[PDB]
């Protein structure tokens, strides 16, 4: 019933990323927990008011011992205590004094106090440790003066009471969260041998065991019905995903129980080896996973963890400095919960971005091949509007009907824009035209040749633009999806006849705003589609400039079911809503005048980025589904372009990359919590205006020098004079168009600025002059 997995596929990143994230968060949480434990290992071992908290009238009703008081409340309780002074627990001593106990209980009848039976049974008559109102009045001044048996827990409110209605209910708040290990890493009471690191090891052991067992069950057990594709769909059937996680948790429960009972040493190494081998097994089995069973494995692991957290552990239990230590431990707990939330967000983002990194290598080779077998050089090097037809008749046509790899998936199309405003040739001039002479765009219908409507509508109709998918963008303007269309034919022989008919019937010479040839390709070996777009723009009659775009993408459809992109998108929406509501609450707690300081501007950016990523991914899925449904209906009748899907996929990938970059930067700046490593970032914050001033001065100096150079260079042709001597201090060889060509100079001047900063990088060393000084000041005061 067990099958050795085969070395199929190449590799799976989902399981590896999940295991790496779990190990990293475990290591960071272990570091934090050790920092807290060493703080509360040797040390740390409104309820109190100004009422008579002692009763010293007893005669022979005391002994040298201690006492304790346990109370419950709304997510708050108390514990034992031991205090003494100079009287050394005098007989019936009236000690009306309270220490900074953690007894943050409420105004409820939940309290039980008892002393130590040092010697014989004491029948002392002590009223109570009365407390009425000091800061919040969490108790009531109601003393009963009731006595119990020897060291027996005296009843109280706000000597043989041994019944399961009360004896067992004591553990409902005493050992409740002391053993619910998942929600107990920050509930460790003193006088216990837990160390708060054994809990972390047990938790990471449980997580790794769940992951490994689920990976084994999906990737090795396939002898019943192969447990894949037949009925175990990736979509939740409600009887398979839970039915494997619950069973996995039940089977793996005893090995965790053994280690827990051993703890309750050398078990650290045993648990480390066990989690290491489990992770290795999960990674080895991970290679044999199609995406559907991969998301099924993710959901099964989540279900098993939830079942362990909520189903088994709750039923497992049924078998000077003091005013700042509390603040520091509260800060540590906040750090822990924020770290857990951030690691969950980082895992979701990593799965959203690098979910399919195998196609990222194949897409590059596919687009390179499509360019090299389309003769991109021969297309980008055409300027007139009469070599288009020979280029198509010689290159493209043998590529469409030329049966080879990368099948066609739909006939090509040629759509033209008329502009109705026939252009005039211009004098040679410096060219570099922005083709602004365009006016309106033609919309009427025309017959064969051009305008001559005899009977009804023209044979060359406008074919009004589609609502979704347009705006190729270009030098002249931003186009759309409309234009006069020609289908170029189906067979190779008739295609040549159509091409020559368009040649000799006055089609492209006169008006011709654009040509807009477009294609699509399919690669089933890697399962990738490709959108190919070829465009020639005619700024003036007899002149053209070329553009080529090959966009490889993957056709992910919304109707496919519970895809990984869908899950990542819904998780990102949930995270964005959580961040937005938290920020809105915190902002409302301060009202107006919060727009000051970057603190409130780093949250809106994150929320907007997350929302944009999720919405763009959802839009891409919907557009892909709509386009596929449109295309499937009739193949040899329509083009059904896929450019919008490619653009949406590119935008979603860019947004995910930007979000991951921001998360990595945030992780980088959270390294300050080491005492000696907190200086660095601090200096970067304390020396910022100096860097701004240096940058402004350098920009002004560069502007002055650039003006000097531009005025000097544009004088005449080579004469070997002093002007070129002074201008030769830059741009390699007494002038190289400021090191970026003029055609590239009127294209994103920020890039040229960056290039010139890179070339003259010795000026930036001036910044060091500032930074060093600051580092000598900030570091000199911490000591």
């Amino acid at each position: 019933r067990f099958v050795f997995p085969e070395p199929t596929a190449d590799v799976n990143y989902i399981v590896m990323l999940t295991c790496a994230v779990c190990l990293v968060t475990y290591m960071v949480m272990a570091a934090i927990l050790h920092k807290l434990d060493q703080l509360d290992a040797s040390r740390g071992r409104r309820f109190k008011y100004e009422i008579l908290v002692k009763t010293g009238w007893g005669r022979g009703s005391g002994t040298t011992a201690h006492v304790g008081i346990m109370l419950y409340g709304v997510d708050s309780r108390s514990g034992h205590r031991h205090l003494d002074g100079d009287r050394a627990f005098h007989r019936n001593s009236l000690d009306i004094f309270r220490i900074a106990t953690p007894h943050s209980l409420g105004s409820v009848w939940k309290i039980r106090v008892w002393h130590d039976n040092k010697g014989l049974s004491p029948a002392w008559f002590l009223q109570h440790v009365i407390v009425r109102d000091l800061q919040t009045a969490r108790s009531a001044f109601f003393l009963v003066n009731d006595w119990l048996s020897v060291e027996t827990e005296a009843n109280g409110g706000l000597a043989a009471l041994l019944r399961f209605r009360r004896l067992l209910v004591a553990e409902l708040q005493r050992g409740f969260f002391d053993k619910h290990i998942w929600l107990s890493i920050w509930d460790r009471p003193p006088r216990s041998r837990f160390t708060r690191i054994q809990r972390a090891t047990c938790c990471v052991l449980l997580i790794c065991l769940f992951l490994g067992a689920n990976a084994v069950w999906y990737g090795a057990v396939g002898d019943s019905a192969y447990s894949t594709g037949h009925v175990s769909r990736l979509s939740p059937l409600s009887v398979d995903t839970v039915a494997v996680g619950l069973v996995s948790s039940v089977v793996v429960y005893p090995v965790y129980l053994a280690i827990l009972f051993l703890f309750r040493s050398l078990a650290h190494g045993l648990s480390l080896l066990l989690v290491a081998v489990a992770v290795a097994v999960s990674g080895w089995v991970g290679a044999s996973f199609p995406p559907g069973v991969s998301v099924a494995w993710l959901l099964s692991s989540s279900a098993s963890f939830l079942a362990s957290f909520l189903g088994w552990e709750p039923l497992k239990v049924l078998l000077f400095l003091a005013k700042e230590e509390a603040r520091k431990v509260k800060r540590l707990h906040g750090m822990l919960r924020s770290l857990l939330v951030y690691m969950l967000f980082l895992l979701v983002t990593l799965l959203a971005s690098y979910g399919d990194a195998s196609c990222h290598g194949h897409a590059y080779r596919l687009q390179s091949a499509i360019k090299q077998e389309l003769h991109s050089r021969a297309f980008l090097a055409i300027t007139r509007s009469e070599e288009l037809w020979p280029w198509m008749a010689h290159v493209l046509l043998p590529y469409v009907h030329g049966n080879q790899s990368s099948p066609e998936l739909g006939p090509p199309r040629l759509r033209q824009v008329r502009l109705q405003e026939a252009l005039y040739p211009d004098p040679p001039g410096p060219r570099v035209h922005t083709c602004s002479a365009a006016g309106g765009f033609s919309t009427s219908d025309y017959d064969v040749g051009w305008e001559s409507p005899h009977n009804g509508s023209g044979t060359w109709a406008y074919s009004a633009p589609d609502l979704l998918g347009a705006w190729s963008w270009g030098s002249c303007a931003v186009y759309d999806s409309g234009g006069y269309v020609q289908e170029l034919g189906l067979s190779l022989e008739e295609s040549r006849d159509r091409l020559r008919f368009l040649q000799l019937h006055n089609w492209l010479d006169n008006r011709s705003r654009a040509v807009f040839l477009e294609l699509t390709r399919y690669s089933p070996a890697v399962g990738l589609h490709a959108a190919v777009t070829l465009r020639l723009e005619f700024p003036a009659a007899g002149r053209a400039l070329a553009a080529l775009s090959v966009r490889p993408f993957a056709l992910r459809r919304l109707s496919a079911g519970l895809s990984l992109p869908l899950l990542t998108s819904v998780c990102l929406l949930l995270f964005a809503v959580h961040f937005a509501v938290a920020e809105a609450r915190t902002w409302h707690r301060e009202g107006r005048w919060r727009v000051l300081r970057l603190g409130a501007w780093a949250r809106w950016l994150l929320v907007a980025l997350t929302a944009a990523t999720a919405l763009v991914r959802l839009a891409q899925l919907g557009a892909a589904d709509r386009q596929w449904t449109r295309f499937v209906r009739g193949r040899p009748r329509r083009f059904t372009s896929f450019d919008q899907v490619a653009q949406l996929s590119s935008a979603a990938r860019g947004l995910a990359a930007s979000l991951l970059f921001l998360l990595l930067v945030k992780a980088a700046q959270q390294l300050r919590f080491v005492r000696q490593w907190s200086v660095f970032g601090k200096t970067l914050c304390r020396a910022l205006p100096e860097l701004l001033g240096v940058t402004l001065g350098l920009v002004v100096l560069g502007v002055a020098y650039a003006q000097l150079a531009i005025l000097l260079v544009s004088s005449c042709v080579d004469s070997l004079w002093s002007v070129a001597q002074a201008l030769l201090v830059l741009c390699p060889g007494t002038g190289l168009s400021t090191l970026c060509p003029a055609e590239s100079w009127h294209l994103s001047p920020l890039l040229c600025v960056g290039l010139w900063a890179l070339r003259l990088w010795g000026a930036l060393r001036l910044g060091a002059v500032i930074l060093r000084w600051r580092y000598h000041a900030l570091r000199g005061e911490l000591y």
Binding site: G762, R765, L766, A768, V769, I770, R772, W773
Partner: peptide, 26 residues
């Protein structure tokens, strides 16, 4: 080329110290 930076850094330190000591009593 690393000796211009020494002069500039030293002058910056001297100027900062002079300004800090002048501001203390004013």
């Amino acid at each position: 080329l690393n000796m211009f930076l020494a002069i500039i850094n030293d002058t910056y330190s001297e100027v900062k110290s002079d300004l800090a000591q002048q501001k203390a009593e004013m």
